[PDB]
Design an enzyme around this catalytic site. Sequence first.
Site, PDB file in Angstrom:
ATOM      1  N   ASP A   1       0.854  -1.200   0.000  1.00 40.01           N
ATOM      2  CA  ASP A   1       0.000   0.000   0.000  1.00 40.01           C
ATOM      3  C   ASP A   1       0.894   1.256   0.000  1.00 40.01           C
ATOM      4  OD1 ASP A   1      -2.699   0.691  -0.297  1.00 40.01           O
ATOM      5  OD2 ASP A   1      -3.125   0.754   1.849  1.00 40.01           O
TER       6      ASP A   1
ATOM      7  N   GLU B   1      10.656   5.724   3.377  1.00 41.23           N
ATOM      8  CA  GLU B   1       9.791   5.600   2.180  1.00 41.23           C
ATOM      9  C   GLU B   1       9.951   4.128   1.809  1.00 41.23           C
ATOM     10  OE1 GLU B   1       6.955   6.268  -0.214  1.00 41.23           O
ATOM     11  OE2 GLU B   1       7.727   8.136   0.684  1.00 41.23           O
TER      12      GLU B   1
ATOM     13  N   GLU C   1      -0.243  15.590  18.349  1.00 38.18           N
ATOM     14  CA  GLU C   1       0.652  15.509  19.495  1.00 38.18           C
ATOM     15  C   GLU C   1      -0.124  15.060  20.748  1.00 38.18           C
ATOM     16  OE1 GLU C   1       4.795  16.397  20.792  1.00 38.18           O
ATOM     17  OE2 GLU C   1       3.732  15.713  18.982  1.00 38.18           O
TER      18      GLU C   1
ATOM     19  N   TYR D   1       8.073   7.709  22.240  1.00 40.78           N
ATOM     20  CA  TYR D   1       7.674   6.868  21.118  1.00 40.78           C
ATOM     21  C   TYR D   1       8.193   7.414  19.787  1.00 40.78           C
ATOM     22  CZ  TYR D   1       3.834   9.110  18.417  1.00 40.78           C
ATOM     23  OH  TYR D   1       3.039   9.896  17.607  1.00 40.78           O
TER      24      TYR D   1
ATOM     25  N   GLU E   1       0.798   5.128  19.292  1.00 42.68           N
ATOM     26  CA  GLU E   1      -0.152   5.902  18.499  1.00 42.68           C
ATOM     27  C   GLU E   1      -1.571   5.385  18.451  1.00 42.68           C
ATOM     28  OE1 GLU E   1       2.063   8.931  15.411  1.00 42.68           O
ATOM     29  OE2 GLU E   1       0.836   7.299  14.582  1.00 42.68           O
TER      30      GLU E   1
ATOM     31  N   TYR F   1      -6.881   6.916  18.411  1.00 46.92           N
ATOM     32  CA  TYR F   1      -8.223   6.329  18.364  1.00 46.92           C
ATOM     33  C   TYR F   1      -9.055   6.715  19.598  1.00 46.92           C
ATOM     34  CZ  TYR F   1      -5.939   3.283  14.855  1.00 46.92           C
ATOM     35  OH  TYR F   1      -5.055   3.014  13.827  1.00 46.92           O
TER      36      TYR F   1
ATOM     37  N   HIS G   1       3.846  13.764   2.898  1.00 44.90           N
ATOM     38  CA  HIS G   1       2.603  13.022   2.965  1.00 44.90           C
ATOM     39  C   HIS G   1       1.939  13.884   4.086  1.00 44.90           C
ATOM     40  CE1 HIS G   1       4.962   9.619   1.416  1.00 44.90           C
ATOM     41  NE2 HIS G   1       3.847   8.939   1.224  1.00 44.90           N
TER      42      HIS G   1
ATOM     43  N   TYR H   1      -2.451   9.945  -1.541  1.00 43.10           N
ATOM     44  CA  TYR H   1      -1.526   8.898  -1.958  1.00 43.10           C
ATOM     45  C   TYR H   1      -2.003   7.486  -1.679  1.00 43.10           C
ATOM     46  CZ  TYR H   1       0.416   6.956   2.478  1.00 43.10           C
ATOM     47  OH  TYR H   1       0.639   6.263   3.648  1.00 43.10           O
ATOM     48  N   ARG H   2      -3.097   7.388  -0.923  1.00 45.73           N
ATOM     49  CA  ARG H   2      -3.569   6.103  -0.415  1.00 45.73           C
ATOM     50  C   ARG H   2      -4.925   6.404   0.212  1.00 45.73           C
ATOM     51  NH1 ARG H   2      -0.035   3.460   4.486  1.00 45.73           N
ATOM     52  NH2 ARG H   2      -1.142   1.435   4.726  1.00 45.73           N
TER      53      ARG H   2
ATOM     54  N   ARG I   1     -10.108  -2.657  -6.067  1.00 46.99           N
ATOM     55  CA  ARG I   1      -8.847  -2.131  -5.536  1.00 46.99           C
ATOM     56  C   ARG I   1      -8.373  -0.957  -6.381  1.00 46.99           C
ATOM     57  NH1 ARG I   1      -5.099  -0.435  -2.104  1.00 46.99           N
ATOM     58  NH2 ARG I   1      -3.137  -1.619  -2.031  1.00 46.99           N
TER      59      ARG I   1
HETATM   60  C1  LIG Z   1      -4.498   3.605  12.761  1.00 48.12           C
HETATM   61  C2  LIG Z   1      -3.223   3.977  12.555  1.00 48.12           C
HETATM   62  C3  LIG Z   1      -2.815   3.572  11.334  1.00 48.12           C
HETATM   63  C4  LIG Z   1      -1.524   3.882  10.881  1.00 48.12           C
HETATM   64  C5  LIG Z   1      -0.631   4.635  11.715  1.00 48.12           C
HETATM   65  C6  LIG Z   1      -1.062   5.062  13.055  1.00 48.12           C
HETATM   66  C7  LIG Z   1      -2.353   4.740  13.497  1.00 48.12           C
HETATM   67  C8  LIG Z   1      -2.817   5.188  14.854  1.00 48.12           C
HETATM   68  N1  LIG Z   1       0.632   4.962  11.347  1.00 48.12           N
HETATM   69  C9  LIG Z   1       1.046   4.594  10.106  1.00 48.12           C
HETATM   70  C10 LIG Z   1       2.388   4.860   9.717  1.00 48.12           C
HETATM   71  O1  LIG Z   1       3.259   5.306  10.451  1.00 48.12           O
HETATM   72  N2  LIG Z   1       2.710   4.538   8.387  1.00 48.12           N
HETATM   73  C11 LIG Z   1       1.857   3.941   7.471  1.00 48.12           C
HETATM   74  O2  LIG Z   1       2.201   3.676   6.367  1.00 48.12           O
HETATM   75  N3  LIG Z   1       0.624   3.615   7.941  1.00 48.12           N
HETATM   76  C12 LIG Z   1       0.251   3.912   9.175  1.00 48.12           C
HETATM   77  N4  LIG Z   1      -1.047   3.494   9.598  1.00 48.12           N
HETATM   78  C13 LIG Z   1      -1.931   2.694   8.643  1.00 48.12           C
HETATM   79  C14 LIG Z   1      -1.716   1.133   8.847  1.00 48.12           C
HETATM   80  O3  LIG Z   1      -2.089   0.749  10.145  1.00 48.12           O
HETATM   81  C15 LIG Z   1      -0.278   0.583   8.557  1.00 48.12           C
HETATM   82  O4  LIG Z   1       0.074   1.087   7.279  1.00 48.12           O
HETATM   83  C16 LIG Z   1      -0.192  -0.979   8.567  1.00 48.12           C
HETATM   84  O5  LIG Z   1       1.234  -1.188   8.477  1.00 48.12           O
HETATM   85  C17 LIG Z   1      -0.888  -1.504   7.374  1.00 48.12           C
HETATM   86  O6  LIG Z   1      -1.249  -2.898   7.778  1.00 48.12           O
HETATM   87  P1  LIG Z   1      -0.386  -4.136   7.338  1.00 48.12           P
HETATM   88  O7  LIG Z   1       1.072  -3.828   7.366  1.00 48.12           O
HETATM   89  O8  LIG Z   1      -0.970  -5.305   8.126  1.00 48.12           O
HETATM   90  O9  LIG Z   1      -0.773  -4.326   5.789  1.00 48.12           O
HETATM   91  P2  LIG Z   1      -2.030  -5.181   5.218  1.00 48.12           P
HETATM   92  O10 LIG Z   1      -3.260  -4.729   5.865  1.00 48.12           O
HETATM   93  O11 LIG Z   1      -1.734  -6.641   5.164  1.00 48.12           O
HETATM   94  O12 LIG Z   1      -2.003  -4.747   3.676  1.00 48.12           O
HETATM   95  C18 LIG Z   1      -2.338  -3.374   3.304  1.00 48.12           C
HETATM   96  C19 LIG Z   1      -3.036  -3.371   1.955  1.00 48.12           C
HETATM   97  O13 LIG Z   1      -2.079  -3.849   0.924  1.00 48.12           O
HETATM   98  C20 LIG Z   1      -2.712  -4.716   0.001  1.00 48.12           C
HETATM   99  N5  LIG Z   1      -2.148  -6.098   0.102  1.00 48.12           N
HETATM  100  C21 LIG Z   1      -1.605  -6.655   1.264  1.00 48.12           C
HETATM  101  N6  LIG Z   1      -0.996  -7.744   1.117  1.00 48.12           N
HETATM  102  C22 LIG Z   1      -1.036  -7.946  -0.200  1.00 48.12           C
HETATM  103  C23 LIG Z   1      -0.492  -9.005  -1.017  1.00 48.12           C
HETATM  104  N7  LIG Z   1       0.212 -10.011  -0.486  1.00 48.12           N
HETATM  105  N8  LIG Z   1      -0.690  -8.929  -2.370  1.00 48.12           N
HETATM  106  C24 LIG Z   1      -1.382  -7.886  -2.925  1.00 48.12           C
HETATM  107  N9  LIG Z   1      -1.933  -6.854  -2.228  1.00 48.12           N
HETATM  108  C25 LIG Z   1      -1.718  -6.945  -0.864  1.00 48.12           C
HETATM  109  C26 LIG Z   1      -4.197  -4.717   0.358  1.00 48.12           C
HETATM  110  O14 LIG Z   1      -4.851  -3.690  -0.410  1.00 48.12           O
HETATM  111  C27 LIG Z   1      -4.165  -4.391   1.820  1.00 48.12           C
HETATM  112  O15 LIG Z   1      -5.411  -3.889   2.271  1.00 48.12           O
END
Ligand SMILES: *Cc1cc2c(cc1C)nc1c(=O)[nH]c(=O)nc-1n2C[C@H](O)[C@H](O)[C@H](O)COP(=O)(O)OP(=O)(O)OC[C@H]1O[C@@H](n2cnc3c(N)ncnc32)[C@H](O)[C@@H]1O
Lengths: 515, 515
Positions: free
Chosen positions: A161, A171, A280, A361, A374, A378, A430, A467-468, A506
């Site tokens: 993502d 990045e 913050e 943190y 973080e 929520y 971002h 971007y997302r 998607r």
């Molecule tokens: C709620 C929250 C979220 C958050 C954050 C702080 C808080 C309080 N801080 C973030 C940060 O510092 N940076 C960032 O990029 N995101 C942040 N978030 C959002 C989120 O919680 C995180 O990004 C988390 O790392 C994402 O979850 P995870 O790492 O488990 O990824 P996933 O859910 O499995 O996949 C995300 C999306 O990618 C596509 N996908 C996943 N796997 C695949 C495969 N194998 N093949 C093809 N596509 C795939 C899907 O679209 C999926 O939904």
Amino acid sequence: AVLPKGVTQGEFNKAVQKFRALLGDDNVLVESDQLVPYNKIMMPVENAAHAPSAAVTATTVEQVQGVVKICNEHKIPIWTISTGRNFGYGSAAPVQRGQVILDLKKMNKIIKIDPEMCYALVEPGVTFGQMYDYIQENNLPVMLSFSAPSAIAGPVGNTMDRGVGYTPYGEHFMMQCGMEVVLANGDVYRTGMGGVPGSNTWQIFKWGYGPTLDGMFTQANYGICTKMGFWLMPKPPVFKPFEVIFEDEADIVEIVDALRPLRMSNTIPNSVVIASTLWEAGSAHLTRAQYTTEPGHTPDSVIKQMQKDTGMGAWNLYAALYGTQEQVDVNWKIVTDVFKKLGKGRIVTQEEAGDTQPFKYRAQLMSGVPNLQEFGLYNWRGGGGSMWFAPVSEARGSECKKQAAMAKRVLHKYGLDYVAEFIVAPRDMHHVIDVLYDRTNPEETKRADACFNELLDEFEKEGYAVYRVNTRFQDRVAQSYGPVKRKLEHAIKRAVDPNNILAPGRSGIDLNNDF
Amino acid sequence: AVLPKGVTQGEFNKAVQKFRALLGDDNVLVESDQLVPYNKIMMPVENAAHAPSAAVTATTVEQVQGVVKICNEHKIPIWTISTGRNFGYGSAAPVQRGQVILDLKKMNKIIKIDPEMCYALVEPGVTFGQMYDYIQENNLPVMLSFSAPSAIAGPVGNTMDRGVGYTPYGEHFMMQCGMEVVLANGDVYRTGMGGVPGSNTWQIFKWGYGPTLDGMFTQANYGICTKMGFWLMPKPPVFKPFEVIFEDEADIVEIVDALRPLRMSNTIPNSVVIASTLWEAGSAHLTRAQYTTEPGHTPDSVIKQMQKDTGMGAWNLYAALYGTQEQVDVNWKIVTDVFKKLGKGRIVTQEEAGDTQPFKYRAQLMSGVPNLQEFGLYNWRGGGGSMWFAPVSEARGSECKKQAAMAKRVLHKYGLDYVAEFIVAPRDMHHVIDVLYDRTNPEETKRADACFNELLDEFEKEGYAVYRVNTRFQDRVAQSYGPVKRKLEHAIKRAVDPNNILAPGRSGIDLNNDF
Ligand SMILES: *Cc1cc2c(cc1C)nc1c(=O)[nH]c(=O)nc-1n2C[C@H](O)[C@H](O)[C@H](O)COP(=O)(O)OP(=O)(O)OC[C@H]1O[C@@H](n2cnc3c(N)ncnc32)[C@H](O)[C@@H]1O
Ligand SMILES: *Cc1cc2c(cc1C)nc1c(=O)[nH]c(=O)nc-1n2C[C@H](O)[C@H](O)[C@H](O)COP(=O)(O)OP(=O)(O)OC[C@H]1O[C@@H](n2cnc3c(N)ncnc32)[C@H](O)[C@@H]1O
Ligand SMILES: [Cl-]
Ligand SMILES: [Cl-]
């Protein structure tokens, strides 16, 4: 009964039969109770709108190949997740109601961590916490780039993502190297140097020869990632995290313009954060209710009171230096000289901050240490409503000021808060805005949905796009980038997934669309 | 008469008629004399094998759209070039005999150079020299990353083949941001943030939203690039180029292992070069004939004599430091300490080197100054024969030693020399080997063709493949990366260019193939 779009109970039963034969009953989840954790969402819409018809947990590449074979046979759309912690972007639930979730969390092996060449090769289910514990317990001289807020999130899902972290390797997609995907036809394709028999450079050289396709699979539905490599930063002799606090909202122009040359020259090498007062506050586990229970947004007058009581500024900049002590010392002089010359900004050191939050943190984030602090965001308003509005911006002060003012106006119009931070690359930000609301309140939930739509509209009016984005808005955001792009994306979609089985919807890519 | 593959004179005439109506007679070249410069090649095969049927010089995007319309109408295959200086990779000639060359050299406007955000947006015909003169004359605080050996080569053509330079921005595709391509159907597609109406972030944030496709077009034939952006390094206060000379061929293991941590930590931030004796000699304009006229390869005994007479080592490392004087001084201490601890390597400073070559041109390369010094490699043996054999390697000493020994053995077997350099990224090397021979000598030309084939075979046996290759060998190198990759590439090809009009044969992608 939840069934995939336009698919019959009979065809669904046939697919489930085959999924069970292929994966075993314990890896095929069709009961309501089993699907509960998968259906949890923070988007302003009822759970039913993103309810999966089932979830299957594959462990091997051969099983993933088997899953797509079955999906093509019975036209079953699958939503792939790796670690599923995509909070604020749709969590683990599918983009369209009725999809079967292909959950790869059991495909969790760390294939290799090379401490000399500084890279890792992992499966989708590998988590940040899993890698951190292995690296620390084995004293490996490498560090991670961690995305908040979950230690059970991971690099593959985050990179698919195109998420971000807070070290110089923040990045994530920039540092990715080598990818394996299972295509809809079952073929196992390896990008870059991976297709060369006996290669030892899959995690070494990104591009390979001919078209380089790793990016084509990210934020897309052209394949299922089953392995991914990425570069790791070597552990530095010295880490020096620090903060610079600014008292006024209007300071953002000067903050960004003073910071940009430091980032452009790599003097400050990590993805710096410039966090607004409310981000913050929430990250420090403060709640709106501690300050006011009145309806609407949190007034500037209350925020200034908050700043007074806590020492938190209108903007809170977290950055770090890395290197030998002599390198750190020279860069520290350059950094402190810039802020002294600016005449704005109070510097806070790691020593001064101690164990206090948010500094603690933030220092963890800037050194790749998984942590859950973080999750406090929520609880700013609670109620389970959270959507990330993340427009891209030039790292130019006037642009950041403009976007901050635009978002604040729109959020306040709908009774919500500007809770945001700029994640700073040398040239881009971002601009991450957490749209927080009480999802248990129908009236407020409707305001949040309307607010998110208006944020998208107003930002597009100024030439800005995100971007997302969460699953409820992926089709809407695809419109921001124009019709020619969508037409090309659908032509590629038809070519690699003629039956439209891979996560249709998607990023707004679905063969049912008229593109 | 040279005609496109399987195309009739009548259909070709119709296309030429339309090209003239669209572009004007002066932009449609069909006469032998006019095609002479386009047919020049350095590959071991007669000119006829890569002879174009015509060349058309488009100036605007609308003309490029018109060209593809005509090509689809009469099934005319076009080979696109930007500045056409791809010496050692096919020069300006097409991959298949009979293709029409779409020469974009007249599409030469610098659209923008942003000195604050440090980026450029340019058309294909923009040259390195053109940008350098504009930047210098206008005193803009940015510098270029320059690819040898031509000042009239340019960033678009070089990046479309994923070429490299010698500053910290030397991996050209890594620094690319934003791309416009005309697709076979005439659509104008902009990657990243370019599709957002009124965007100001096309050259700011690479990925955009949804699949990020810039890489899919590089080293491919899925579109015609008409604009490209890229990031520029801000001009540093201090530039300190230096060299480290090593006397023995076997030193390569230690050189690479000592250098890697310096690159991994960014202490030495540019794409360092470790040049072999003969590359060093040719770049200094020395020729084989000055030392021997005997047949075969140049003996080690002659090379050691060369080292004695010139001061050139078995390996000659060129690197640079950039930053404020204090940053440079601290990094210089770290670098000198590493070589002192190693106990091998003689350091040569910019002051000591003076105007002597090769140091002088190396310092220019490491600061992005266009220059023509490396044309000297073409005179080591002369005769117009030159093909780059450029295998990828881990930046691990043992791997570099292995590859150097393998290439030397194969080249000597065929009476040719190991003339090479490692271009050093933190984790990978582009191990660039210049296969030089007298193309006016039929017997030697046949040995060179056989030698190149054997180099490819022997390197594949050890799991190594090249990152880029001349047109005569593009299909052969595609085989190195496996059938699944080629099948996916052909499925995308069919989707975006059903009539196979865009450079069929590029990177081995041609719908006439059974993939
Ligand atoms: C709620 C929250 C979220 C958050 C954050 C702080 C808080 C309080 N801080 C973030 C940060 O510092 N940076 C960032 O990029 N995101 C942040 N978030 C959002 C989120 O919680 C995180 O990004 C988390 O790392 C994402 O979850 P995870 O790492 O488990 O990824 P996933 O859910 O499995 O996949 C995300 C999306 O990618 C596509 N996908 C996943 N796997 C695949 C495969 N194998 N093949 C093809 N596509 C795939 C899907 O679209 C999926 O939904
Ligand atoms: C001979 C020689 C060559 C050389 C070098 C030193 C010597 C003595 N040093 C090099 C270096 O430091 N770095 C590097 O990457 N290459 C070096 N070379 C090889 C070559 O001369 C340069 O790379 C030169 O910069 C390449 O020429 P140019 O910049 O003019 O690029 P081009 O010929 O137009 O295009 C190259 C290939 O890209 C594809 N192409 C080009 N334009 C397009 C567009 N618009 N759309 C789609 N594809 C495009 C073609 O395949 C083309 O052949
Ligand atoms: Cl969510
Ligand atoms: Cl050539």
